[PDB]
Design a protein around this motif. Structure first.
Motif, mmCIF file in Angstrom:
data_model
loop_
_atom_site.group_PDB
_atom_site.id
_atom_site.type_symbol
_atom_site.label_atom_id
_atom_site.label_comp_id
_atom_site.label_asym_id
_atom_site.label_seq_id
_atom_site.Cartn_x
_atom_site.Cartn_y
_atom_site.Cartn_z
ATOM 1 N N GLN A 13 0.824 -1.199 0.000
ATOM 2 C CA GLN A 13 0.000 0.000 0.000
ATOM 3 C C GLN A 13 0.861 1.252 0.000
ATOM 4 N N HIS A 14 1.925 1.267 0.805
ATOM 5 C CA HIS A 14 2.825 2.417 0.795
ATOM 6 C C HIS A 14 3.507 2.571 -0.562
ATOM 7 N N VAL A 15 3.932 1.457 -1.162
ATOM 8 C CA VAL A 15 4.555 1.525 -2.484
ATOM 9 C C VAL A 15 3.583 2.124 -3.498
ATOM 10 N N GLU A 16 2.331 1.667 -3.472
ATOM 11 C CA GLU A 16 1.341 2.186 -4.408
ATOM 12 C C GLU A 16 1.063 3.661 -4.143
ATOM 13 N N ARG A 17 0.917 4.036 -2.871
ATOM 14 C CA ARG A 17 0.723 5.435 -2.514
ATOM 15 C C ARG A 17 1.815 6.298 -3.121
ATOM 16 N N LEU A 18 3.068 5.860 -2.994
ATOM 17 C CA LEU A 18 4.167 6.660 -3.528
ATOM 18 C C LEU A 18 4.108 6.735 -5.047
ATOM 19 N N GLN A 19 3.778 5.623 -5.710
ATOM 20 C CA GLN A 19 3.604 5.675 -7.160
ATOM 21 C C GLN A 19 2.531 6.688 -7.551
ATOM 22 N N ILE A 20 1.439 6.741 -6.790
ATOM 23 C CA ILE A 20 0.275 7.524 -7.196
ATOM 24 C C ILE A 20 0.567 9.017 -7.085
#
Ligand SMILES: Cc1ccc(NC(=O)C[C@H](CCC(=O)O)c2noc([C@H]3C[C@@H](CC(C)(C)C)C3)c2C2CC2)c(Cl)c1
Lengths: 227, 14
Positions: free
Chosen positions: A213-220
């Motif tokens: 979730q943190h990885v996706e948040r940073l991508q977004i």
């Protein structure tokens, strides 16, 4: 036959060693190379975004190494691309979590990071003390079990190959792969008298979900932060 | 377990 299962154990462990990112001996050697208070303060002075960006890059590189591991497992490249992606999506971050225990030193409670060992305070800039503490506790539990390199290899191979993952189209191929891996791992645990080691593994799904979730948040939200 | 991880995986797989 026994020889085929021994060969499957050898091949899985070989692939894992090939894709394990860092050789365990190098991690043990660097255990003595610890961050100084100035370096820890330097990491703590970084912005939350800078530190999370570095950590997310590391997690992404690890996910890529886990994909490389999966690609070297006999039969995983025979599965359709949809099934491959379902399996990787569902298990890769858990495999990253498992792998991370090799870089954890229970004696001083430090972890390898960007070339040196440092305690939890290195991550003060992340502002997620709950998740950081939980992942350190997970790595501590795995280190206490003395999880070996072959055991990590086989357990992660089985974490990835799971025929119960929602989304699979060719459940029978995945079932056969998982069964062969179960045979190999069972034979290894019997040879080593480590059969009960799987009842002691702690849960890991929630931590892996939070990391993804943190990885996706940073991508977004990357357009609202510096390049 | 989400779309960004799936993007990483699709890139590294092909
Ligand atoms: C407890 C804990 C356990 C292990 C590690 N580090 C290793 O396993 C080394 C690896 C470098 C390998 C290489 O450089 O190829 C690495 N370095 O950073 C990370 C990120 C930081 C993130 C952890 C948290 C959630 C605390 C931010 C993992 C990693 C791992 C592979 C993802 C750390 Cl850091 C903390």
């Amino acid at each position: 036959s026994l020889t085929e299962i021994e060969h499957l154990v050898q091949s899985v462990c070989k692939s894992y060693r090939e894709t394990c990112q860092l050789r365990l001996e190098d991690l043990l050697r660097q255990r003595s190379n610890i961050f100084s208070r100035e370096e820890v303060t330097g990491y703590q002075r970084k912005s939350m975004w800078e530190m999370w960006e570095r950590c997310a890059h590391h997690l992404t590189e690890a996910i890529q190494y886990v994909v490389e591991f999966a690609k070297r497992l006999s039969g995983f490249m025979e599965l359709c691309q949809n099934d491959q992606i379902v399996l990787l999506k569902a298990g890769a971050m858990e495999v990253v979590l498992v792998r991370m225990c090799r870089a954890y030193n229970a004696d001083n409670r430090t972890v390898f990071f960007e070339g040196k060992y440092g305690g939890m305070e290195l991550f003060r800039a992340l502002g997620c003390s709950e998740l950081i503490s939980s992942i350190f506790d997970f790595s501590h539990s795995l280190s206490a079990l003395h999880f070996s390199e072959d055991e990590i290899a086989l357990y992660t191979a089985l974490v990835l190959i799971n025929a119960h993952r929602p989304g699979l189209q060719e459940k029978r191929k995945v079932e056969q792969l998982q069964y062969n891996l179960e045979l190999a791992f069972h034979h290894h645990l019997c040879k080593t008298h480590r059969q009960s080691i799987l009842a002691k593994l702690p849960p890991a799904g929630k931590l892996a979900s939070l990391c993804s979730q943190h990885v996706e948040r940073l991508q977004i939200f990357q357009h609202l932060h510096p390049i | 377990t989400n779309m960004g991880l799936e993007a990483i995986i699709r890139k590294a797989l092909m």
